[PDB]
């Protein structure tokens, strides 16, 4: 299928408590593989998946230098943003950025990304053309003017079409035993009485990877989206994910309800009913 590599950068000011913390985490699809944290006793890029551990010293040192540099750039960014919004020196603020590439089944670039947000609001983003910017407000237009003069989009484009796609393809190969393995969900329907009149049917999906799944309840074949409690997909802790969906049904109408599960790891989409 399609694949992506993404980096998630969080920088948080903390006036009175040192300089802004900078953390970068890298993902291939749903699999975290690196971290850097300026608050570690010895900040360095560190492996967080087994397959990346075979990269050599020069990979780790190059990434560590990049993240120490990015640490300084985000701290200067945070000072500038404070000026752009006329904000006091006394408050804590957050600067986030996510960037990376998506590739198709044939390894070709599908699209690149480079988005930033300030205090939780979209601030500036590289457009899909990888050549122009969308600024959210007059503050971000100042950033846009700086980045146009410094030709940041051209340099981002080079990274995204070159390094990012090449290294995503390398990681996918080195980690193929996990990254290119879809694990299907283990599924069950549980039944939880509420009262004499109603009961909860809960459809479980456990242990699956990647996180993408469709888990739906139908009544006489009509989707029950409006009456379904669908919890957010949640990490199990072992790289896999979990999800469930529940509907409240009239007592004795259980068999009119079917749970349908679609996941890349299943040989066939699943149709589940309550088996008492």
């Amino acid at each position: 299928g399609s694949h992506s590599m993404r980096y998630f950068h969080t920088s948080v000011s903390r006036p009175g408590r040192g300089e802004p913390r900078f953390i970068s985490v890298g993902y291939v699809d749903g699999t975290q593989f690196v971290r850097f944290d300026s608050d570690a006793a010895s900040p360095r890029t560190e492996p967080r998946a087994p397959w990346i551990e075979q990269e050599g010293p020069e990979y780790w040192d190059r990434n560590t230098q990049i993240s120490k540099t990015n640490t300084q750039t985000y701290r200067e960014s945070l000072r500038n943003l404070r000026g752009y919004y006329n904000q006091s020196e006394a408050g804590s603020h957050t600067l986030q950025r996510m960037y990376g590439c998506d590739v198709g089944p044939d390894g070709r670039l599908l699209r690149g990304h480079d988005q930033s947000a300030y205090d939780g609001k979209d601030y500036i983003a590289l457009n899909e053309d990888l050549s122009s910017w969308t600024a959210a407000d007059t503050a971000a237009q100042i950033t846009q003017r700086k980045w146009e003069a410094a030709r940041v989009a051209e340099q981002l484009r080079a990274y995204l079409e070159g390094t990012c796609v090449e290294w995503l393809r390398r990681h996918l190969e080195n980690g193929k035993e996990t990254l290119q393995r879809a694990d299907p969900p283990k599924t069950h329907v549980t039944h939880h009485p509420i009262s004499d009149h109603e009961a909860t049917l809960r459809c479980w999906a456990l242990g699956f990877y990647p996180a993408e799944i469709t888990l739906t309840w139908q009544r006489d074949g009509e989707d029950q989206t409006q009456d379904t409690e669908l919890v957010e997909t949640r990490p199990a802790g072992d790289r896999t994910f979990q999800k469930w969906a529940a509907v409240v049904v009239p007592s004795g109408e259980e068999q009119r309800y079917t749970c349908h599960v679609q996941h890349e790891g299943l040989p066939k989409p699943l149709t589940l009913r309550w088996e008492p």
């Binding site: 990049i66 500038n80 600067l95 601030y123 700086k146 410094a150 940041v152 981002l156």
Partner: peptide, 9 residues
């Protein structure tokens, strides 16, 4: 590897 972000905001 990561990208070094060419400018402060």
């Amino acid at each position: 590897p990561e990208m070094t972000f060419f400018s402060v905001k």
